[PDB]
């Protein structure tokens, strides 16, 4: 409940993690840098989204080269550049899942060790409405939560190559 994992998650909530509302509902979204952010492809964003309740025009959208979609928003604010934290070193890592959508606002779940199975799998009974949650640890952003099987959750892996 404390330690640097919690501080990292809270700072991400402060600067980079938002609620993105599409016609399919509320999802957690991750700002990467500039005006680029990421959401689950299942969210099916249109030409406008709500970013923490504010209507924002989508300048561009595209799927990645895995259930993740990149949006460039028509927004004033820039995201803190968190690309340096994107990591694929996840073994031996007790991770947190940070969600900010639906009733799970400012929510930091400690999901335990994570492994590849390919997606990242973590043993924690996930509820619905947490899609888009950021899988991370201190100084490390691993992926975006895109589903579960009722006893495990699964995250699509983030990679530095996706963002030039």
């Amino acid at each position: 409940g404390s330690g640097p994992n919690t501080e990292f998650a809270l700072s991400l909530l402060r600067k980079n993690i938002m609620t993105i509302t599409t016609s399919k509902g509320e999802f957690t979204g991750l700002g990467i840098h500039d005006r680029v952010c990421v959401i689950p492809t299942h969210a099916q964003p249109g030409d406008d989204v709500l970013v923490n309740g504010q209507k924002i025009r989508v300048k561009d959208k595209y799927k990645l080269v895995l259930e993740l979609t990149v949006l460039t928003l028509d927004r004033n604010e820039k995201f803190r550049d968190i690309r340096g934290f994107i990591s694929e070193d996840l073994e031996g890592v007790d991770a947190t899942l940070v969600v900010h959508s639906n009733n799970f606002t400012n929510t930091i779940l400690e999901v335990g060790p994570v492994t590849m199975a390919r997606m990242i799998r973590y043993d924690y009974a996930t509820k619905t409405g947490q899609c888009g949650g950021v899988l991370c640890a201190t100084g490390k952003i691993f992926g975006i939560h895109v589903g579960g099987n009722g006893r495990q959750g699964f995250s699509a892996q983030l990679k530095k190559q996706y963002f030039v």
Partner: antibody
Amino acid sequence: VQLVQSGAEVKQPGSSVKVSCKTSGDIFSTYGFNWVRQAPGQGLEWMGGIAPVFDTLKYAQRFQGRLLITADESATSVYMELSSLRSDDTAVYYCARAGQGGVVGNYLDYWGQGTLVTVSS
Amino acid sequence: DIQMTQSPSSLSASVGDRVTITCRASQGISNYLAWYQQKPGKVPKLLIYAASTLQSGVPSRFSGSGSGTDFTLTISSLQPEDVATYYCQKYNSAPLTFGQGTKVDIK
């Protein structure tokens, strides 16, 4: 990893001192940094910290109200400014990197060389 | 505030001796504890974090143990280069409080 601090300072009571700490630029934009001081012959004392990537600021209660910690990206440096100097502020001031990245609150894995501040009286 | 206290505060031992230093936190800090070594006239240096994880490069004669409130740093065979002051520090959350330090000398 390199943390290069500014040079020795001599100050009178009631004034203020600013100490700088320079790092590479990759490190500045990803890590947190802490200020720790050490009076002559005494122990280490945590003063505060900043993670520039997230504007995370933390201050020790003992210095709250007379300590300002800042960052400049162009200079890739973090700073501490201590005001209302008293002679018990005579100490070596250390800049130190918090480990792993993105946080102030962590173990400190690299230390700058230290800056002696002498407050006369 | 919060207290980090070490025991003993100083000791003198012989080369080859087993040396044990303890640290007590007034509040539980789980395993968010680091140990630092400050050799005379040098800057402090990280020896151990997460209470028992050796920083890379640190000799294996240094070991740490404990969780919660009671922690121990052990030097299994005291070497001349180990003369120093050793500090514990919590980082469960701010403040990142240091213990008062334990001065280790050799007769």
